[model samples]
Target chain A: DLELKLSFQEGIAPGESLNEKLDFMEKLGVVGFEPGGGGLAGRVNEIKQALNGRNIKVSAICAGFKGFILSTDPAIRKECMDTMKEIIAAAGELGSTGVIIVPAFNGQVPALPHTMETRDFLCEQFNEMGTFAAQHGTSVIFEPLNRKECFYLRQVADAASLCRDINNPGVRCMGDFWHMTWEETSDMGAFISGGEYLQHVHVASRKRRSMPGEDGDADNYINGFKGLKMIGYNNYVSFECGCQGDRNVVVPAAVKLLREQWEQA
Target chain B: DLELKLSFQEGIAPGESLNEKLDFMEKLGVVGFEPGGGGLAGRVNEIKQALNGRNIKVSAICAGFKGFILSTDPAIRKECMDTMKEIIAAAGELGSTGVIIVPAFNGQVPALPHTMETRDFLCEQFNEMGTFAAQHGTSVIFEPLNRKECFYLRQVADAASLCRDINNPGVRCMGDFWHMTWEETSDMGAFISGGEYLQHVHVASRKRRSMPGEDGDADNYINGFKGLKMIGYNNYVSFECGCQGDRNVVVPAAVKLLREQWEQA
Candidate 1:
């Protein structure tokens, strides 16, 4: 049996305090909360206190590191590793699933060229990060972005392939529906290709990147839901999108839409 | 060292006579011609006569079979095989690349249910057809349609996977940009997944299914061209769409756009 464990980024929830957010999410049947990784260690006590009597748990830590792993400069790479390790450790403490990371994004200067050498270097660096993450009882998840946003790692299968090569229990990958709209041929195919390494999912309006169901027919997620069910995916499908209307109204409606679609799927 | 070998469905080309069509296509640097298979056997003599010493050759023969291979009814299945074998034989005589076949289309009643049993049956039937095609010095090409048009085969990789399982040299698969726009996450990834079994390709405007470049910026084919170049693909990227304007104007502009994109890729 498949179950939908919905999650929200810290900012997307309609509340000012962590306690208030947990209250709203609990009422809505959302089971997970994704906090930003920056200063996550410092916020752990407050987060745990707020969720002491609630059902919600930390889902995944969104990227907040200072430098990219694929930077051409050695100092930048080292800084990235150091900060990421700190965040991964915090994630473990918070009982989070993983820390999301993009190897490189477009226009990130002093970045390694897109080459076999860079890919090999990426595997080696990520393998070390994976080792560190495993030691902390957490994982480092690779997030594949769209080609326009990131020249490297634009497809889920490619990221999953890299994870396979890295061959670490702490290494994983994820998919974003908004990016998949422009980059993938099939949502089901992309997720199936990710297989066991698919640790998290991001969803939004297919064309607008806003709340789900905002784009009408374009916001369909049945195919992806089917894939998730086939893989017996038990992780969170998080709301990583903006909203064009009232959050209270659109958020509930989006939740309703997803639940109905989940049943159909 | 890659080359663009463009082709057109016979109906899409502009000309009153076969000679006139060949003249126009020759001037536009098209190197292949794709004729509908319904009456291709009878038309071969005329086609050969007109192309006496032309540079263009035959590409894949479009679907002309009366029945579908995935029909649940034995009689319908037999009819499909009989007509497809005839087309394949004619294709071989014409020195054509292959004959395109869709296992089943939407609303094709008495069709086999979409299940493992159906898939296994499909493989068995296609394997036999492949053996017959090879004997005739030709192949049978699988054309995957969008989910809206067909349920069984919807992605290039899925069709390629079936081909791999069939394990026949005479069984191949194709990709259509119009369908891929709705079905695929990445055009390049889809083609790369198709690999050696990728025999032919179809293209149109991204959103409207009209001539290439008619959809303005939405009609990008750079990613797909990159896949073709990477695969060292030498088969025809044929015009399988309608034209919104005069053929003389729109066709030439489309050709120019493709050539420029090919260079960029």
Candidate 2:
């Protein structure tokens, strides 16, 4: 079985109260949340209070520490790492599954360093952070963004290889449907490679990165679902994309479609 | 000297309160609003209260009565006319310039009613309603949507010529850039032809009807602006479009671009 979550930043309908969203989501049978944007450290307590009366819980926290690039300056990298540690601690207290992480974004020349240098730096960072995350009984789920967005870790295979070498229980990888559509040659194969390292998930349609089941749009989650099933992954799959129309109309419908696709897989 | 207004429906960042939006828009130098989507009939007093003490005014109110087709049953048309009259009266109470109306949408049967049938009916209805609107010191501004959205009136020329024939002081027409980009060969010529008949305007980028000046996308308002100048039109050109990115970032930037382009025009 699979659970669904939505981004704290973009998922809820515009102008809707947090309590109203939880009430609606609980009715829709969504079990969890994935807090993002500025991350959960600052707002964890308030978020927890909001979720207190609801059946839903916070499932995952995404890239709470912004601009923590592996290839950045030593001081900047340390600050980034420190911020990440703070988030991990906060997330653990919040009872979240993990913190989603990325090595670096696209285009930043000298500060970005070189491929080999960045890769090595990331491994070192992910490992140290992974150990710290383990202490909290949480994970640092690595993400592979699309090439258009980032030059490094453009595919799940790259993330899988990194996780394999690090071999840290706290260091895992997750797949995003938007990135996978452009990066992975085969969605099923990519998830299979992710293997037990796979922990969390994200999804959106291809054309506009919008909610699926809109008009005639198709997201086709079957292959990825099959791969997740093979890996015995039963974690939260969050929606990390934009909505085509009204969020209230599209978001709930999106979760329904995701569940339906997962069942098909 | 064209004043700029924006749609109350789409211009305000979704989820933001009316107070917050007015505060934001006032800072950005926006001076007016066009309350739409069921028009100003229901919340006239609350909307007026919000606009109070601000430099902003209500420019126009849209036809909120859905599916109020002119070529449809006489009862339905009357209902649409009555509803629009209410909006017109409400808009006038708010000191809005007028009420915006579309005759009907495309694809309903008597599928593609004869031109004489549609035109004669609209002329009759517009005059009767225009008289009612004039009683409230408000006019009825007709909109000619794109062919895809409406097979009825596809060009500003269609609206202008029709208005010229009908010759009602309360009956007028306006141009929407998003629709004009697809329907009119030259935005400049269309506006010039519209002349004194052009009572209002709408703006959006050519692509995806997104906020202007986003992702290097162009709205190309110069032609339309030049035409507005030709007509000596010194009124609001509201933003009635979708936004691609963060509304907080895009909305203000859109207003800035409108000013920049207006200067060029």
Candidate 3:
């Protein structure tokens, strides 16, 4: 395909712990790992250390959090905020970018009351986080979620909407297509319409959740990767998918198929 | 601001009873509604009757169900297939084009396992549904959900992959920006890059459950409409968001803002 590239991933099937995750990544010839959830930095740092001599890397640390972005209270929200900062600092230590941020859940009550509130609050807090991230010269990537589990964001337009409001260079968005395909009104064509607010991305399939082409997966993505090409995104897609078989079967299959499908454009 | 188009929406948020949601949409001044989950003809008739010389038109129906897709149990799977056909036929009656098909989310199994089974067990079912939809001059649109809630696709490229496999003119995709922002590897642009696999669109701000502009409410996505214009998308970006204040007060505001903000880009 391309000239040369190695694979490594962070996410995996349920019941995968810190060590097993690295094992799976190694099995797939992976060279990196994105330990997103915070508090796991201890585990991540341990993993990072293990991979130090070898090949694995901690690309980014997701701040494991609750009500991080949408909380209304001072103490609860502050705790979330502080922990996020810790993750960012951890990222800095781990040779990762800033923290990968999801709009923490809306709590029991939907934290976002309306459009304006969503923007104001995100801007208010992210600006704070952005400032914190700036101290380290990093940026926080905002990730939108599906409609059901995470009611806050169901589409990319919404993320763009929020990013527009945040107005800080430190904040942008991460588009996950599987979720977009499920709940979005338009297709990928509609998702990217969001101006420059878009930043990171995650690539995974929607069906069996296997490799790109394992389940007779067929997609016309000639210009699919072209979006990154068009936007000049040189970041890692970070094959955040699961394996049906072992890394031997699933990882290579997913990587090969997905990479092939993406390059056709 | 542009001459903003506004509407009232009725229904339980999404993933609720589609059958009972139309009257609510019509009551709310909705110009159109997506297909509901029920006997397709019956669902259409109900909506048509509710509209009864009213203004709202029927948009896309949620159809790309795993009816024929994946299931460890045969009977349950068969029932799903039957329901899918029924939904499609029912969708045609409501003046809708296709069904909002979820590639696969088996009740018990995760996405990858299900994906592996889809081609062997699902593609044929999809083709079958496609044939039925064609007969009615209707189509199917495959959707992807968040990784936590979905299995196969996490990015628009994944949607593009499925589209290429189905290879049908009628089957296009709606690049819902919010989902793309949440999971895909690329930024907003990758969604639009899905090419023609994109069809209709569902618009929202971020993952805060806030309307377009709210923040607590992180990233109300106030300027989301501007992003759409940045990409030059001429499609209708529907209001698929929840509001704060009065449902009535918030709904109209969300829709109007979506239209008004489009001018900013």
Candidate 1 backbone collisions, by pair: A183-B185, A183-B186, A184-B184, A184-B185, A184-B186, A185-B183, A185-B184, A185-B185, A185-B186, A186-B185
List DockQ for all candidates. Answer: 0.03, 0.01, 0.10
- Give TM-scores for every candidate, taking all chains together and pairing residue i with residue i: 0.56, 0.48, 0.49
| lDDT by residue for model 2 (B1-265), tens | 5544444443555446887877877787777677783746668778878887888888767667644655456667667777777788887788777788877676544432533445566787788877877788878888978757875665565577567667788888888899887666557656755767888888887878888777354567886787687668866777778888898888878888888887898
In candidate 2, the second chain superimposes onto the true chain B with a TM-score of 0.92
Candidate 3: stretches off by over 4 Å: A1-8, A11-29, A40-45, A104-110, A184-199, A218-223, B1-265
Q: Ten-residue segment with the worst summed lDDT in candidate 2 chain A?
A: A2-11
Q: What is the CA-based DockQ of model 2? A: 0.01
lDDT of 2 by residue, A1-265 (tens): 5433443333554446777767777777777777772756778778889888777788778886845655447777887788889899988888878888877776533355433445566888899999999999888888988757765566565576678768889898888888877655446656755667777778777778877666344578887777677567767777777777887788778777877877788
Q: Model 3: per-residue lDDT, tens digit, A41-74?
A: 5665576666765666655455575555565566
C-alpha RMSD for every candidate: 20.4, 24.5, 13.8
lDDT of 1: 0.86
Ranking by TM-score: 1, 3, 2
**Predicted candidate 3, C-alpha RMSD:** 13.8
